[PDB]
Design a protein around this ligand. Structure first.
Ligand SMILES: Cc1ncc(COP(=O)(O)O)c(CNc2csc(C(=O)O)c2)c1O
Ligand SMILES: Cc1ncc(COP(=O)(O)O)c(CNc2csc(C(=O)O)c2)c1O
Lengths: 280, 280
């Protein structure tokens, strides 16, 4: 395959990372993941906007305009002949002799991007998945989509060890988000999800789902709920660029209602399906 | 010059880091810095022990014995002909297609180490430095010396822009540690420092300084203090492998006592001086 490296498209094996790349020594960088469906990038503008917002939050200046970044992604998808899967891309502050403080503005960011073929998780969407609650021990700027992902790594591993698809995180029993998703609960036909402050990532899929709820006249309340309240919900699901709307039918051996995917989850899945590129 | 790469000392130009090294994508790794004085490593055993401890805390298995690791560090120091400076070394979970959960145990960790010449910070040891308070927004496993350093990066940059040497961090108005140091206060000839729990890194220099206090019959209380209390200390200093015992004489324009280096800090600096390698 081919990898985007700065503004060049290069054979994968030509790409070399420096040991003093600040992404490698400090996790000093930001990233995005964009889903591609039948050759078309879904919500690419929103992801590019969020990459630049994440970068700006940690004062990294991306050296290309958004239009040029968009063009590069297009070229990367075409060169790799990606049909259905995702583009991963990240920006780090660059390479400089190791020191905590920022280097001279003479240092250029390092941009890496690549593709992976990866089907829609149709089985999960239909049947739902199991999850587990795990304490949120992450830093307090979860609104920045950074490469500092070690709390999420440990949470995901714990979930995978329990045979669960996702770890639902909580700060002293207040549900925040998933180790790599946003978390929604439904009760009495109302959609609940934690508000977008410094405690969660403002997911692109989260935002599409809220729009879907508005389109079908389902009330949305962006207020947090507890782990104990979550267990009493009528329906629960998680969202991400790759997981789409993935129903959660069981948490830690306790069924959500009857352990079946709920009616409102299905309605949202139906509205979501209208937004994604189809062949054709 | 020469870089430790996995189990070999190679020319720096031979080192190849993969874009999917989990140190680069998740900050999934741990590290150490060791001071070398006139060719001799200081407290190297304690730093190797801490490296293995940090690794174990995130379930990385280092693929060779502590004896082997010590051997490789000695060779690294000789090949580079390091006089006075430091060795940096890190271990990541390894290279694997991108996924939050751990890869299979077939994946070897990546070890990178290199040297830098860096003199003792003479001026700071003598004259003391300025510091600034910065709210501690880092994750809740600060006892692990991980590559997830973005909180510390932003804190140090804040200090540097205000012309300060160090950011002194505080969580719930309680002083924890510095962005890259531990913090000690002295009041009425007693030495105070935050206890070694999940809120701070248990510094090697910190432990040496506590040993030194014991040797000069100075009482030590590992009890945390607030920002308000810090400003009322008789003396204040920070410790790290490269800072040694750096007096702090002002925080945010407020002088610590008279803004002079205090008598107890000098006594501790003198005691510390007896521990460093001296081949005359
Ligand atoms: C902490 C946290 N919260 C929410 C999300 C969801 O964000 P969007 O992908 O919807 O923008 C994410 C992104 N997760 C994610 C993106 S692709 C993917 C995967 O499993 O492949 C996962 C996250 O890391
Ligand atoms: C958050 C945090 N707390 C305490 C320390 C001090 O630990 P020791 O270096 O004493 O083991 C450190 C390590 N600091 C440090 C080591 S080398 C260095 C430098 O300025 O070069 C700095 C740290 O990062």
């Amino acid at each position: 395959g081919y990898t985007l490296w700065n503004d060049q498209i290069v054979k994968d094996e030509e790409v070399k990372i420096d040991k003093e790349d600040r992404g490698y020594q400090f996790g000093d960088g930001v990233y995005e993941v964009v889903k591609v469906y039948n050759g078309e990038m879904f919500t690419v503008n929103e992801h590019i906007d969020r990459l630049y917002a994440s970068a700006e939050k940690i004062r990294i200046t991306i050296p290309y305009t958004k239009d040029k970044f968009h063009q590069l992604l297009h070229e990367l998808v075409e060169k790799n002949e990606l049909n259905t899967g995702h583009i991963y891309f990240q920006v780090t502050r660059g390479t400089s002799p190791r020191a905590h403080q920022f280097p001279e503005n003479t240092v250029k960011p390092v941009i890496i991007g690549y593709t992976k073929e990866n089907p829609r998780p149709l089985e999960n969407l239909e049947k739902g998945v199991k999850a587990t609650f795990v304490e949120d021990i992450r830093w307090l700027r979860c609104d920045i989509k950074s490469l500092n992902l070690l709390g999420a790594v440990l949470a995901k591993q714990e979930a995978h060890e329990k045979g669960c698809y996702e770890a639902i995180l909580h700060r002293n029993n207040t549900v925040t988000e998933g180790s790599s998703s946003n978390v929604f609960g439904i009760k009495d036909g109302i959609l609940y999800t934690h508000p977008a402050n410094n405690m969660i990532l403002k997911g692109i899929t989260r935002d599409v789902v809220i729009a879907c709820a508005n389109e079908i006249n389902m009330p949305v309340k962006e207020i947090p709920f507890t782990t104990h309240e979550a267990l009493k919900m009528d329906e629960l699901f998680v969202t991400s660029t790759t997981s789409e709307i993935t129903p959660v039918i069981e948490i830690d051996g306790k069924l959500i209602r009857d352990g079946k995917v709920g009616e409102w989850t299905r309605k949202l899945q139906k509205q979501f399906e209208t937004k994604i590129p189809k062949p054709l």
